[PDB]
Design an enzyme around this catalytic site. Structure first.
Site, PDB file in Angstrom:
ATOM      1  N   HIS A   1       1.076  -1.080   0.352  1.00  0.00           N
ATOM      2  CA  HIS A   1      -0.090  -0.386  -0.271  1.00  0.00           C
ATOM      3  C   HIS A   1       0.689   1.370  -0.160  1.00  0.00           C
ATOM      4  O   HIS A   1       0.130   2.323  -0.391  1.00  0.00           O
ATOM      5  CB  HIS A   1      -1.089  -0.087   1.451  1.00  0.00           C
ATOM      6  CG  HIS A   1      -2.126  -1.220   1.256  1.00  0.00           C
ATOM      7  ND1 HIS A   1      -1.795  -1.919   2.234  1.00  0.00           N
ATOM      8  CD2 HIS A   1      -2.511  -2.164   0.567  1.00  0.00           C
ATOM      9  CE1 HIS A   1      -2.636  -2.838   2.322  1.00  0.00           C
ATOM     10  NE2 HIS A   1      -2.946  -3.183   1.212  1.00  0.00           N
ATOM     11  N   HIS A  60       5.061   7.247   6.211  1.00  0.00           N
ATOM     12  CA  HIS A  60       4.632   6.715   5.128  1.00  0.00           C
ATOM     13  C   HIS A  60       4.976   7.533   3.847  1.00  0.00           C
ATOM     14  O   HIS A  60       4.270   8.639   4.105  1.00  0.00           O
ATOM     15  CB  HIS A  60       4.128   5.833   4.399  1.00  0.00           C
ATOM     16  CG  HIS A  60       2.381   5.804   5.317  1.00  0.00           C
ATOM     17  ND1 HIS A  60       2.009   6.460   6.321  1.00  0.00           N
ATOM     18  CD2 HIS A  60       1.933   6.538   4.206  1.00  0.00           C
ATOM     19  CE1 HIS A  60       0.898   6.552   6.422  1.00  0.00           C
ATOM     20  NE2 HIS A  60       0.298   6.779   5.626  1.00  0.00           N
ATOM     21  N   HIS A 100       2.942   8.608  -0.492  1.00  0.00           N
ATOM     22  CA  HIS A 100       1.311   8.838  -0.931  1.00  0.00           C
ATOM     23  C   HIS A 100       1.686   9.304  -2.473  1.00  0.00           C
ATOM     24  O   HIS A 100       2.285  10.409  -2.394  1.00  0.00           O
ATOM     25  CB  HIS A 100       0.452   9.248  -0.315  1.00  0.00           C
ATOM     26  CG  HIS A 100      -0.540   8.868   0.297  1.00  0.00           C
ATOM     27  ND1 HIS A 100      -0.790   7.685   0.888  1.00  0.00           N
ATOM     28  CD2 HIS A 100       0.268   8.920   1.959  1.00  0.00           C
ATOM     29  CE1 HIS A 100      -1.012   6.992   1.401  1.00  0.00           C
ATOM     30  NE2 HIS A 100      -0.802   8.344   2.090  1.00  0.00           N
ATOM     31  N   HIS A 145       3.073  11.323   4.865  1.00  0.00           N
ATOM     32  CA  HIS A 145       2.379  11.348   6.196  1.00  0.00           C
ATOM     33  C   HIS A 145       3.359  10.958   7.179  1.00  0.00           C
ATOM     34  O   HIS A 145       3.902   9.875   6.999  1.00  0.00           O
ATOM     35  CB  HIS A 145       1.062  10.602   6.274  1.00  0.00           C
ATOM     36  CG  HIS A 145       0.550  10.926   5.049  1.00  0.00           C
ATOM     37  ND1 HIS A 145      -1.109  10.278   4.741  1.00  0.00           N
ATOM     38  CD2 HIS A 145       0.383  12.259   4.731  1.00  0.00           C
ATOM     39  CE1 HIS A 145      -1.424  10.958   4.115  1.00  0.00           C
ATOM     40  NE2 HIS A 145      -1.285  11.910   4.271  1.00  0.00           N
ATOM     41  N   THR A 202      -6.574   6.762   6.312  1.00  0.00           N
ATOM     42  CA  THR A 202      -6.886   7.419   4.264  1.00  0.00           C
ATOM     43  C   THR A 202      -7.319   6.263   4.525  1.00  0.00           C
ATOM     44  O   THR A 202      -7.560   6.381   2.999  1.00  0.00           O
ATOM     45  CB  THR A 202      -6.461   8.316   3.742  1.00  0.00           C
ATOM     46  OG1 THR A 202      -4.620   7.502   4.260  1.00  0.00           O
ATOM     47  CG2 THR A 202      -6.299  10.011   4.754  1.00  0.00           C
ATOM     48  N   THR A 203      -7.487   4.879   4.612  1.00  0.00           N
ATOM     49  CA  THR A 203      -7.078   3.852   4.349  1.00  0.00           C
ATOM     50  C   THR A 203      -8.093   3.058   5.297  1.00  0.00           C
ATOM     51  O   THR A 203      -8.123   3.680   6.361  1.00  0.00           O
ATOM     52  CB  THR A 203      -5.590   2.731   4.634  1.00  0.00           C
ATOM     53  OG1 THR A 203      -5.205   2.730   5.343  1.00  0.00           O
ATOM     54  CG2 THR A 203      -4.950   3.736   3.603  1.00  0.00           C
TER      55      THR A 203
HETATM   56  N1  MUE Z   1      -2.708   7.308   5.423  1.00  0.00           N
HETATM   57  S1  MUE Z   1      -2.930   7.490   7.180  1.00  0.00           S
HETATM   58  O1  MUE Z   1      -4.259   8.209   7.284  1.00  0.00           O
HETATM   59  O2  MUE Z   1      -1.665   8.157   8.166  1.00  0.00           O
HETATM   60  C1  MUE Z   1      -2.827   5.940   7.644  1.00  0.00           C
HETATM   61  C2  MUE Z   1      -3.832   5.031   7.538  1.00  0.00           C
HETATM   62  C3  MUE Z   1      -3.869   3.491   7.951  1.00  0.00           C
HETATM   63  C4  MUE Z   1      -3.363   3.032   8.838  1.00  0.00           C
HETATM   64  C5  MUE Z   1      -3.311   2.203   9.560  1.00  0.00           C
HETATM   65  C6  MUE Z   1      -2.690   2.132  11.413  1.00  0.00           C
HETATM   66  C7  MUE Z   1      -1.735   2.551  11.912  1.00  0.00           C
HETATM   67  C8  MUE Z   1      -1.747   3.985  11.185  1.00  0.00           C
HETATM   68  C9  MUE Z   1      -2.390   4.496   9.441  1.00  0.00           C
HETATM   69  C10 MUE Z   1      -2.143   5.598   8.889  1.00  0.00           C
HETATM   70 ZN    ZN Z   2      -1.070   8.383   4.505  1.00  0.00          ZN
END
Ligand code: MUE
Ligand code: ZN
Ligand code: MUE
Ligand code: ZN
Lengths: 251, 251
Positions: free
Chosen positions: B60, B86, B88, B111, B192-193
């Site tokens: 992802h 991470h 995008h 992020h 956002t996932t």
């Molecule tokens: N893209 S995000 O919003 O930064 C995101 C998405 C899924 C997650 C699942 C577990 C911990 C942190 C997370 C952060």
């Molecule tokens: Zn993210």
């Protein structure tokens, strides 16, 4: 624990020694206007006469336990449920509000304490950001009898003894608060009694509520507290902002 | 779940159909200026070369695990520890930021995910207001090679395969973020996932960071995702504000 007499409050709860405590002195000059602060929304506050509500002299305030069903939003996605309300007051000729404005102490103050709808219990919300929210309004001397307040004030004589309680009919809880839900101060602070946990969102109405001089005398003069003492001046000392900025919903 | 695949995200996680989701379209002229919003504080972000950090293709995104000691404050007493970061990103001549500004999508987005210090574990913070805080910055094309990003981008080669990981030297995580920590957008939204948990405080820097055309190509073009697919266009559509006002730290 007690007001103006041991045991020290930090000996009871370490959190009573936190940097970001309540109540505070509100200086409207130094408050940050934030247009994001929308009018407060209450649902379920217009209660029928039954079931009855418990009203208790807990020796530090008069507390009304609120039923399930009272929903309060500070905004979109900032949702709370009401738990209880209680009052802080002074004594003959001495004001007793907890918050102050530009150093001015008002005669009395109402707190409506709320739990975030992310938590099932107070013990999980304590110290968590936005876990608890308090709605606060000053009470001031007016020339009319406040009929909303009379429903509670007329019952204080039954709970004069410390640790005494009575059942009272449901009423419009929102009628104990100002009519203007759009003008308020908001800051992050603490519970004002042990354990004095931080992360509490305080919302302090600009509009005050009017009680009659006799109503204020009934509030300050009827209840008794620890020992053979009157329940009076049941307010915590004002705490420093310590770099916090108070937001205002209005310019 | 996959990006631009199936299933429907509400079928994997009904939470993904909440009212207060991320990412969102930022419209600066409708953002509310709040002077209470202080400069972000980030301490401990300047990591030494040892110990090494886990960098992982998770199908992802590419994810860098952060060690303990990265402390972040959104305000006074509103503290956070960084867990991971991470990215995008899009594909050959197509932008892949998650957040957008007046409809403009940026080439890529970083992020940095943090945990409130009022919670011991991420799973306690999920869905709780302020439990998680993400720092987001836009990555734009610039004339020069970004030496902070090169430390990560030069290692994507050896984790091209879904679920592969490598160890990288410690680097200065604050060097991946924009110049001015006093200038940002803030609102409350979601992951956002899946699981799309709400109560996430999103801070989006006004200022961007610049990568070379070649660096952005390396980011979009090196990694393989689910099945025999390229890991590209790993962003979620913009989500309705549903009455949320985006705040700005600057007029
Ligand atoms: N893209 S995000 O919003 O930064 C995101 C998405 C899924 C997650 C699942 C577990 C911990 C942190 C997370 C952060
Ligand atoms: Zn993210
Ligand atoms: N006086 S207060 O801040 O409004 C206050 C202080 C301590 C509490 C403990 C438990 C539940 C509610 C509480 C409210
Ligand atoms: Zn109180």
């Amino acid at each position: 624990w007690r007001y103006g007499g041991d045991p020290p409050w930090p000996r009871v709860s370490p959190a009573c020694a936190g940097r970001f405590q309540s109540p505070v002195d509100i200086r409207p000059q130094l408050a940050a206007f934030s247009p994001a602060l929308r009018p407060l929304e209450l649902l379920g506050f217009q209660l029928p006469p039954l079931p009855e509500l418990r009203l208790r002299n807990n020796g530090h305030s008069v507390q009304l336990t609120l039923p399930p069903g009272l929903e309060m939003a500070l905004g979109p996605g900032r949702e709370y449920r009401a738990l209880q309300l209680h009052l802080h007051w002074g004594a003959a000729g001495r004001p007793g509000s907890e918050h102050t404005v530009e150093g001015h102490r008002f005669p009395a103050e109402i707190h409506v304490v709320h739990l975030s709808t992310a938590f099932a219990r107070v013990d999980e919300a304590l110290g968590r950001p936005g876990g608890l929210a308090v709605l606060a309004a000053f009470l001031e001397e007016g020339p009319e009898e406040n009929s909303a307040y009379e429903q509670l004030l007329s019952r204080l004589e039954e709970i004069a003894e410390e640790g005494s309680e009575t059942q009272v009919p449901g009423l419009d809880i929102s009628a104990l608060l100002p009519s203007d839900f759009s003008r308020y101060f908001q800051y992050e602070g603490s519970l004002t009694t042990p354990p004095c946990a931080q992360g509490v969102i305080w919302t302090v109405f600009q509009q005050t509520v009017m009680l009659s001089a006799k109503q204020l005398h009934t509030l300050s003069d009827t209840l008794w507290g620890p020992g053979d003492s009157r329940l009076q001046l049941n307010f915590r000392a004002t705490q420093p902002l310590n770099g916090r900025v108070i937001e205002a919903s209005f310019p």
